[PDB]
Amino acid sequence: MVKKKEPAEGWPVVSGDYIVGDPESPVAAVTLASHIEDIPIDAGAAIAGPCKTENLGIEKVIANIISNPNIRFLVLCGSEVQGHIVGQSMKALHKNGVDDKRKIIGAKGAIPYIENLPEEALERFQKQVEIVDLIDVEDADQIKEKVKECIEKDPGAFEEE
Ligand code: B12
């Protein structure tokens, strides 16, 4: 009975390191430095993978989320990537956006620049999903429960006015 739309053709469009799950699940999971991509998928996520860079890696994540309107949650889990600091950089990008040199405002990551996505693609990212901070948590029971919680709170597919 929840509202679902069809994702872009050949989704996920952009090559990367991830596991695709249910394309209609509302939840995406970035595992960061950790190797736990399976745990969110077996709790019924749409897509889960590591992300180790605070620029190109982040751009690939966003491009592959916005192309599926069913996704309304982005879990950030697993150990933080030392120096790159991808987790905290992404939180900052969601909340603050980018400055006019395309630097992510507030990000502690060493080279937090989004060179390749346009502005409209970020605004969409900020409106489409909400962020769920489980950074430096690898506990399975925890990650599973948060993913099932999001599924229970599925607002359905996104659509701009
Ligand atoms: C080249 C490189 C950087 C480069 C610059 C490149 C850059 N972009 O900033 C430089 C040399 C500057 C660098 C420096 C060091 N690095 Co470095 N670096 C790398 C390397 C090779 C990057 C990997 C890469 O280019 N990946 C391409 C992108 C696309 O990969 P990705 O970020 O993971 O993105 C993935 C996701 O987007 C996913 N994906 C795609 N779509 C979707 C959708 C969804 C929903 C999801 C979930 C996922 C997903 O697919 C992508 C993979 O193809 C890695 C090695 C590695 N094992 O990955 C180390 C790595 C990131 N280095 C890291 C470290 C430690 C550093 C340093 C901090 C080390 C030091 N003390 O000097 C520094 C300094 C940081 C800094 N920037 O100043 C470590 C992290 C260790 C840790 N876990 O704590 C790594 C893993 C190497 C290692 N094993 O030691 N680094």
Residue numbers in the entry: 1 to 161
From the paper:
Genome analysis has revealed an extra copy or copies of the mtrA gene in many methanogenic archaea (e.g., M. marburgensis, Methanobacterium formicicum, Methanobrevibacter ruminantium, Methanothermus fervidus and Methanosarcina barkeri). These cytoplasmic MtrA homologues consist only of a soluble cobalamin-binding domain of 170–180 amino acids, which is in contrast to the approximately 250 amino acids of membrane-associated MtrA. Crystal structures of two MtrA variants revealed a detailed view of a novel binding site for cobalamin inside a Rossmann-type domain compared with all other Rossmann-type B12 enzymes studied so far. Nevertheless, several functionally characteristic features were designed in an equivalent manner. They include an exposed corrinoid ring at the top of loops at the C-terminal side of the central β-sheet, an elongated conformation of cobalamin with the nucleotide tail between the β-sheet–α-helix layer, albeit on opposite sides, and a His-Glu-proton donor linkage on the lower axial side of the corrinoid ring. The structure of cytoplasmic MtrA complexed with cobalamin and the structure of the soluble domain of MtrA without cobalamin were essentially identical. This finding suggested that the MtrA structures observed in this work were relaxed forms. The possible repellent effect of cob(I)alamin towards the histidine residue probably causes a conformational change in the MtrA protein structure 11329. From there, the conformational changes could be transmitted further for sodium-ion transport across the cytoplasmic membrane.
